[PDB]
Ligand binder design. Sequence first.
Ligand SMILES: OC[C@H]1O[C@@H](O)[C@@H](O)[C@@H](O)[C@@H]1O
Ligand SMILES: OC[C@H]1O[C@@H](O)[C@@H](O)[C@@H](O)[C@@H]1O
Ligand SMILES: OC[C@H]1O[C@@H](O)[C@@H](O)[C@@H](O)[C@@H]1O
Ligand SMILES: OC[C@H]1O[C@@H](O)[C@@H](O)[C@@H](O)[C@@H]1O
Ligand SMILES: OC[C@H]1O[C@@H](O)[C@@H](O)[C@@H](O)[C@@H]1O
Ligand SMILES: OC[C@H]1O[C@@H](O)[C@@H](O)[C@@H](O)[C@@H]1O
Lengths: 113, 113, 113
Amino acid sequence: SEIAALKQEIAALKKEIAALKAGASVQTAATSWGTVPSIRVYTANNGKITERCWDGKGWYTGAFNEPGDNVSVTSWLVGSAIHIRVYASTGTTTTEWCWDGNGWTKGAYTATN
Amino acid sequence: SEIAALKQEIAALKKEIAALKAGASVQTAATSWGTVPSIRVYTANNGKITERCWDGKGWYTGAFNEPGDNVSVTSWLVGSAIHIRVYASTGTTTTEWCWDGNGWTKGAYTATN
Amino acid sequence: SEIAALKQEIAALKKEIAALKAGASVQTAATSWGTVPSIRVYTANNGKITERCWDGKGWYTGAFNEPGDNVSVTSWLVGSAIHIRVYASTGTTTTEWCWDGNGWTKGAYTATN
Ligand SMILES: OC[C@H]1O[C@@H](O)[C@@H](O)[C@@H](O)[C@@H]1O
Ligand SMILES: OC[C@H]1O[C@@H](O)[C@@H](O)[C@@H](O)[C@@H]1O
Ligand SMILES: OC[C@H]1O[C@@H](O)[C@@H](O)[C@@H](O)[C@@H]1O
Ligand SMILES: OC[C@H]1O[C@@H](O)[C@@H](O)[C@@H](O)[C@@H]1O
Ligand SMILES: OC[C@H]1O[C@@H](O)[C@@H](O)[C@@H](O)[C@@H]1O
Ligand SMILES: OC[C@H]1O[C@@H](O)[C@@H](O)[C@@H](O)[C@@H]1O
């Protein structure tokens, strides 16, 4: 019956991986500012984070393009200038990315002192 | 020893799926507004997103009830009117949902132009 | 050929778990306040959530240290006092944690009434 147990094991093994990846989806983060408002939506997909932008008219693709399997975001206004920080994580490594009005740059964030 | 390798493989196979789903949990997103404040907490559970609300007294169930395995949220005030956008993702499909004071509606967001 | 199918099954079984955990990473949430600003970044890692803080000078470790596999956060100001709510989830159990200026405390949030 060992071969029959293998047939059952193969079926259980195909079910266990089908179910894993079936329930798998992309992960997003969002932030907004002003009264219009502007909206930025960051999507982690297959180890890549990309950005979509809304400034009142329609949606378009933003500059942000960095690696990661997970993303979070916060932002604040200095008067009307927007400042954005995006936290991108692969494995156990979190990288901070900074928008301060003139391009994305790597930030000072570290996970442990 | 092939049958013995199968016994070991079955044990490794039961460990590999137990560990996967054991570490699995629901995913949440949160937003807030005002000085009271009001709080909204969105929970993705088994392909369903639902909403819990706090307006200063206690917690209750909100109107939001849409499919998705992942959720993010942002909100803004126009004077004292709250506007909410919720980003719900299943597989590779992200759907935007809009609260503007008179019911949830599907938003214009798309992932690629 | 059953033993040969087992050799193939073992290879498929080692690929299916390698790929799972390979794509696995930590999950983060972020919030900010003021014009400096202050930033708080919460990281869920191996069932533990910890906190990193920025108040204008550099990054340091905060007080927050609670269990969970997933985290979300929101915050608001009452004048200049910061109030924070962190939502920590293990399995299907979401616990709210409250910062109101004098230590973290468990909040009134429940998932269903
Ligand atoms: O004008 C669009 C730009 O807006 C900024 O807020 C950032 O989100 C940039 O990544 C983006 O390219
Ligand atoms: O502008 C650069 C700096 O901005 C601060 O607000 C923090 O986000 C730092 O980690 C970052 O390096
Ligand atoms: O009054 C409760 C209502 O508040 C709005 O902000 C939305 O979150 C609705 O989904 C909810 O039903
Ligand atoms: O109110 C409808 C519209 O509101 C805007 O702010 C964006 O979120 C759009 O994608 C949406 O369709
Ligand atoms: O001063 C640092 C403190 O700041 C508060 O906002 C909280 O984030 C605490 O957990 C933290 O220890
Ligand atoms: O300060 C305690 C209370 O604060 C409120 O804003 C909510 O977050 C409650 O769930 C919490 O118990």
